[PDB]
Amino acid sequence: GSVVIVGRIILSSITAYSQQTRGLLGCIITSLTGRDKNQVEGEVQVVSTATQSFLATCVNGVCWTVYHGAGSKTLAGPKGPITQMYTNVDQDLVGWQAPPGARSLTPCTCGSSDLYLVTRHADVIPVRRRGDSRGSLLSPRPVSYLKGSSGGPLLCPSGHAVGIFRAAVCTRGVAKAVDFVPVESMETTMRSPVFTDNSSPPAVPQSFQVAHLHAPTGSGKSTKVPAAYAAQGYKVLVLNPSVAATLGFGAYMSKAHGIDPNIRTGVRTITTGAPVTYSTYGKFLADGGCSGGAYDIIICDECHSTDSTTILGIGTVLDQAETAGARLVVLATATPPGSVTVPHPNIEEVALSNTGEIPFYGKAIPIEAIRGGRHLIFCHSKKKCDELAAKLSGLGINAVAYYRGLDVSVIPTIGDVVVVATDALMTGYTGDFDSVIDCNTCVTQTVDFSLDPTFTIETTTVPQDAVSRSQRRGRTGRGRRGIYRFVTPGERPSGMFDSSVLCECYDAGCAWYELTPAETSVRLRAYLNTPGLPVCQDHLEFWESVFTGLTHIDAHFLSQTKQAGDNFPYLVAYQATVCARAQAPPPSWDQMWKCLIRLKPTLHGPTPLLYRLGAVQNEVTLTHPITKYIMACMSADLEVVT
Amino acid sequence: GSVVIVGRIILSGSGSITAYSQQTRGLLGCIITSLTGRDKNQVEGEVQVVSTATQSFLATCVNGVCWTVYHGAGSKTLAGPKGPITQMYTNVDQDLVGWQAPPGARSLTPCTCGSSDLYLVTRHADVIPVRRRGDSRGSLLSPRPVSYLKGSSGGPLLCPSGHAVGIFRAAVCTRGVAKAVDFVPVESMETTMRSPVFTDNSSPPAVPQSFQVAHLHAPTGSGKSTKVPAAYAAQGYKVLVLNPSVAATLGFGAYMSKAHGIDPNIRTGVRTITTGAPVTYSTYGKFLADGGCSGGAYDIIICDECHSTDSTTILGIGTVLDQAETAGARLVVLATATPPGSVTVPHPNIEEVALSNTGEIPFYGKAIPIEAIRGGRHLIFCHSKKKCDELAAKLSGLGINAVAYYRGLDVSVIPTIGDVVVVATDALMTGYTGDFDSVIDCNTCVTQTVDFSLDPTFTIETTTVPQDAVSRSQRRGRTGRGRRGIYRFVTPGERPSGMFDSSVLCECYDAGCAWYELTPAETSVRLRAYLNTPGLPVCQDHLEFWESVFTGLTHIDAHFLSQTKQAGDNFPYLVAYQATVCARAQAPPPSWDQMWKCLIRLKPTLHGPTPLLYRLGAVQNEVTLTHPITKYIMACMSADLEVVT
Ligand SMILES: Cn1c(C(=O)O)cc2cc(Br)ccc21
Numbered sequence A: 001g002s003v004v005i006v007g008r009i010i011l012s013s014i015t016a017y018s019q020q021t022r023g024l025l026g027c028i029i030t031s032l033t034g035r036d037k038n039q040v041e042g043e044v045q046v047v048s049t050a051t052q053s054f055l056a057t058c059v060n061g062v063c064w065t066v067y068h069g070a071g072s073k074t075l076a077g078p079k080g081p082i083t084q085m086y087t088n089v090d091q092d093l094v095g096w097q098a099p100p101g102a103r104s105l106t107p108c109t110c111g112s113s114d115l116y117l118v119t120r121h122a123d124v125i126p127v128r129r130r131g132d133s134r135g136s137l138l139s140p141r142p143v144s145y146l147k148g149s150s151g152g153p154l155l156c157p158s159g160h161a162v163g164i165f166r167a168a169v170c171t172r173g174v175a176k177a178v179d180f181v182p183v184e185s186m187e188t189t190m191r192s193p194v195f196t197d198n199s200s201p202p203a204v205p206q207s208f209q210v211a212h213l214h215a216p217t218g219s220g221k222s223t224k225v226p227a228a229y230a231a232q233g234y235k236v237l238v239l240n241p242s243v244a245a246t247l248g249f250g251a252y253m254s255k256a257h258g259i260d261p262n263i264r265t266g267v268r269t270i271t272t273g274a275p276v277t278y279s280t281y282g283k284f285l286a287d288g289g290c291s292g293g294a295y296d297i298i299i300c301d302e303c304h305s306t307d308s309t310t311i312l313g314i315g316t317v318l319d320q321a322e323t324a325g326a327r328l329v330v331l332a333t334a335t336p337p338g339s340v341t342v343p344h345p346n347i348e349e350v351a352l353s354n355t356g357e358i359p360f361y362g363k364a365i366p367i368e369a370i371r372g373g374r375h376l377i378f379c380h381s382k383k384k385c386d387e388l389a390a391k392l393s394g395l396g397i398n399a400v401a402y403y404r405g406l407d408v409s410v411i412p413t414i415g416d417v418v419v420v421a422t423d424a425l426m427t428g429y430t431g432d433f434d435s436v437i438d439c440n441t442c443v444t445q446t447v448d449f450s451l452d453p454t455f456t457i458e459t460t461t462v463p464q465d466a467v468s469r470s471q472r473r474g475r476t477g478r479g480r481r482g483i484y485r486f487v488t489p490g491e492r493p494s495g496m497f498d499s500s501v502l503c504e505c506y507d508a509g510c511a512w513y514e515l516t517p518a519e520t521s522v523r524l525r526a527y528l529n530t531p532g533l534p535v536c537q538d539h540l541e542f543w544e545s546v547f548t549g550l551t552h553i554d555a556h557f558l559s560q561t562k563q564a565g566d567n568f569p570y571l572v573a574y575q576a577t578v579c580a581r582a583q584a585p586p587p588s589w590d591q592m593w594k595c596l597i598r599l600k601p602t603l604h605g606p607t608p609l610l611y612r613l614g615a616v617q618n619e620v621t622l623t624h625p626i627t628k629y630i631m632a633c634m635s636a637d638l639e640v641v642t
Numbered sequence B: 001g002s003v004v005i006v007g008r009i010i011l012s013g014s015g016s017i018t019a020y021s022q023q024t025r026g027l028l029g030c031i032i033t034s035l036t037g038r039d040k041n042q043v044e045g046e047v048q049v050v051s052t053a054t055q056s057f058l059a060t061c062v063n064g065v066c067w068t069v070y071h072g073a074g075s076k077t078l079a080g081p082k083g084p085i086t087q088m089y090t091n092v093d094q095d096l097v098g099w100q101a102p103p104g105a106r107s108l109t110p111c112t113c114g115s116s117d118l119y120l121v122t123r124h125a126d127v128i129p130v131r132r133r134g135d136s137r138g139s140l141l142s143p144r145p146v147s148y149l150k151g152s153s154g155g156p157l158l159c160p161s162g163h164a165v166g167i168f169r170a171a172v173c174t175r176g177v178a179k180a181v182d183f184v185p186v187e188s189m190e191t192t193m194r195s196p197v198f199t200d201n202s203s204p205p206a207v208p209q210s211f212q213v214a215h216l217h218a219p220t221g222s223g224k225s226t227k228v229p230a231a232y233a234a235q236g237y238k239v240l241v242l243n244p245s246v247a248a249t250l251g252f253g254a255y256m257s258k259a260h261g262i263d264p265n266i267r268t269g270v271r272t273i274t275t276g277a278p279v280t281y282s283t284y285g286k287f288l289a290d291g292g293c294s295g296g297a298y299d300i301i302i303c304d305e306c307h308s309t310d311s312t313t314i315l316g317i318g319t320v321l322d323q324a325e326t327a328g329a330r331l332v333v334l335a336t337a338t339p340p341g342s343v344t345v346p347h348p349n350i351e352e353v354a355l356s357n358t359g360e361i362p363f364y365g366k367a368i369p370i371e372a373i374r375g376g377r378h379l380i381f382c383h384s385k386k387k388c389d390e391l392a393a394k395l396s397g398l399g400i401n402a403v404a405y406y407r408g409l410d411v412s413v414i415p416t417i418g419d420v421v422v423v424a425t426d427a428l429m430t431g432y433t434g435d436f437d438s439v440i441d442c443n444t445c446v447t448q449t450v451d452f453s454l455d456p457t458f459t460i461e462t463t464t465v466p467q468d469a470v471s472r473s474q475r476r477g478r479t480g481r482g483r484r485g486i487y488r489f490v491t492p493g494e495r496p497s498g499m500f501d502s503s504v505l506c507e508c509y510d511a512g513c514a515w516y517e518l519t520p521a522e523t524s525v526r527l528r529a530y531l532n533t534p535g536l537p538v539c540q541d542h543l544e545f546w547e548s549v550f551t552g553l554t555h556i557d558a559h560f561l562s563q564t565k566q567a568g569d570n571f572p573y574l575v576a577y578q579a580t581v582c583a584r585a586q587a588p589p590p591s592w593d594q595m596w597k598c599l600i601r602l603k604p605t606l607h608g609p610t611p612l613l614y615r616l617g618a619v620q621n622e623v624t625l626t627h628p629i630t631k632y633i634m635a636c637m638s639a640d641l642e643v644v645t
């Protein structure tokens, strides 16, 4: 899929109008071919993916738009797809060399405070400049009005570009201010080198440094490079999200490099006295982060990972490493933000068809492709894993399901098997497979500020991103020839995560790591202020404010939601506490509210509902002080992408 | 475009009822087949996954007919082997449409046994147990979020032996949780299949011996409002002619004296005459203001423009349907050019021309050539007052006599002699009767939608929607009347006709309260009559819900109510009731938008969070949810609400 020009906003006293140039059929053919013979006119383009419509603004002979809209996509152009000239995920900025015909807006220099936002509807909105990247809407407007206007210009009165619109600053669903990428950020990006080589590890600097290591899985990132640093006389800590990978680095280093390292996981610790320690982010956070003086180098491996333990773990590194006497933090990944899945020499890629014995996500699997050999099938849910493995078992194929809750001993280490797994496989099991078959979808959590009364955590099935695709396919072609079969060919942009992940960090801080919400903010700020990492809307102040109010949890409910292993154990147990103490029933009797079953005959009346973590069957009361408190928290400025 | 089969749900042949999906087309494939109507792919399976350019849903073959919901498929064709397949059955009232399937398609067959253990087959190929609790109802064994059931309209309910019981059409919701399912029973299907494909309704009915409701689907200009009462009166019958617009009411009345030889009675707010003639022209407003049917006065009631889904027309017709038999009438004629399920077909007098990007005048993403509007008397439809004023100002610059018409303007602002361009909203068709040399159409309009948003209660959202078949026909119809005309459009195509939103039911109870002195109970009776009469525009039955809401909105300030009435804006009762609660709490309104202007006077004295009852627009001020009326309306949200899927 390419980005497609589907129309234009013509600019002039600043007045505007829109001209559509493409319908649906055209847009979708042009996205697929990447070839657009249509003539480019004007400085503001109305642009489109298959999922989303937005704006693109030409300044300085570059067509700019937002990374959250365009990802790392090509622009359809005359002689074919144009690859992006600039990709800045930290600034939320992309750019393509401006197609022939397109005029540019000149940057604004003569610092005006009267700004005008051009929208997709061709409206010209007064905006008073505040900060470098902020302007206040003179007439506050509902956020929905500003949707699809991302990438549109903010103009000073002379009609010169101050920057491009990227986000609305919300009070209870009403946009009061706008967040824009400034023209100065574009200039910086135009001056930065297009390809920067981060394939080799840095030499340990004299003063503290954060370096980036972009090199494939098993290129040495986590074995050869800690070994080589130790050989120079350094103490190295290597952090990995996976227990199985941390434990497995231990035997690989004893054989390949003659170091018996320290190993640190929840399940198993080995202290040898060695200058190399492998630990998971979790066990590191459990141990209370950086040990003063213990390490010269910290290597944060798989730093594209956007689970809450990793982000909190990395943000702890970034806030504590220099004071603890470290000289080097290496953020290490094969899939940095902005990365795209490209052909692999060892991996033959084959689309699923409709012909085959085994139904799979609307397509089919031939029995021949998986009868014999060791194969991995990725499913989105545990229910799909059980159904598929039961089918395969009846069909006489030796088949096994793996997901969260299951012990990894379900997987045979040798002989024929089809493993039917969720992404839990990434942290439980280290092995590779003759083929990988991928559903190309995953379960994700999103926050919705639904004001009904407060917020909602939603569970949705979404298409995979570039990180998911590459990590799934990377289970084959590992020093062997591999096959990769897929339902769908596409991938979402990589290096972005949802605000519910922030909430999850605060939850885990409170539930597991005995971290105050204030301490969680410090660690997360460190993560957010470090470029080259995945990006999130800055909702640290809001999330801090709601967890701050969650005082005096029942330790027995918290223990129980912790033991049960499910998400948001702190939020779940804090709802249960409010219910038990209000002598009131839970939102429903789902397995989530298990901890309240011994109180089921005594709890009557409306639920003191705090927030929505699933379906609410019972009648609700909005009268609880905690509810009133989380409702006040909703008045916070929330930056939301438009 | 057409409805396109994009895949299928394969059902188990033996043992427990299980199911899997087969995806047969992608997005590109879908959109080519939608335009051409030509689908050379083979039809396998009973349950199809069908798609339009906007929604996606299910269809089930039962007895050689591929069945689905009207609210998904509208009156659209199905892509087939030798081109598009026209619908064989369209039933808006049952919410059921059917195409003759291809020879060799597999159909389900009805449930012979009549069991109470049911199974809903969803579009994700999930088979979910339902307990039957009525002819058209079933309880979900495990209640689920509504979202999960979306896209599964047209799917089958199966008995424990894999036979069709009905087709899914809606979820029954308590506060976002589907607890039950509504379906079209297989009985309703087989009725339809035994019945005439073709029904007349083109000619005015004979007056029956006893009370009957008849439908008159005849062109606008076949004299449905002039010729047909005049012919009924010439036969000795007393006839009442009801119309949405006062301009059409006075217009018809004046035509009758001029042509058909009757000085009729006129009943409108602005002009009332009693001649004692056997014909009476009236607006639905004045009819409702007079307190409905007067006993023994009329033998025949013509409800003209009965496709109109404004609150006064619905309330008007609903009253006639509830009172006419008891008042001794013999006949109710429901008269429209564009009935539910109707479709815009070509007119012989009207040339239809798509707008290009080439032209001096920017118009909704395309352009009007300046030369097209230089020559004569032309009408330009715009969705908003803003767009009208901004366009009439541009044409004023370009040396064109352009005038703006919208609600709140005098129609005398528009001339009769030729040269003119009138830039109008839909208010034109109720305010002004004249025809034009050409019509230019934006193909969009402004509508209101309810959202049950539980934040604290409900939202009335104002939104710009693609026009529907009714909108297209009525707008096009202001040209080519008896002579040649020209119709220019931005977008071809139209949404389906004869459906309206729950918020219109809200508006009826509001208008009952504000204008017509009807208790919510009284309004319920009138609307029940309207929803129970087939052949009329359709709506989700949220009568009990809306009656409960308005039942609690007591002791409104008479002054604020009179102000919202006079100002002419929507929901004058809800606006004035929210303001009443604000004033009496000394609280500010939800915002300082024009909606809340009855409080401007009081702005110095208003402080604190607004006690928010419901949302009628943006809310800028801080809110409190502790008001007894907020609590009461939150309590009303527990109602079983039927929502489509
Ligand atoms: C219920 N569920 C499953 C599943 O196994 O079905 C996977 C998963 C992931 C997230 Br994040 C949230 C909920 C989830």
Ligand SMILES: Cn1c(C(=O)O)cc2cc(Br)ccc21
Binding pocket: B383, B384, B385, B386, B406, B425, B446, B447, B448, B462, B570
């Ligand atoms: C503000 N507005 C306009 C306008 O002229 O802008 C048209 C319209 C129609 C409905 Br229904 C509700 C509100 C509306």
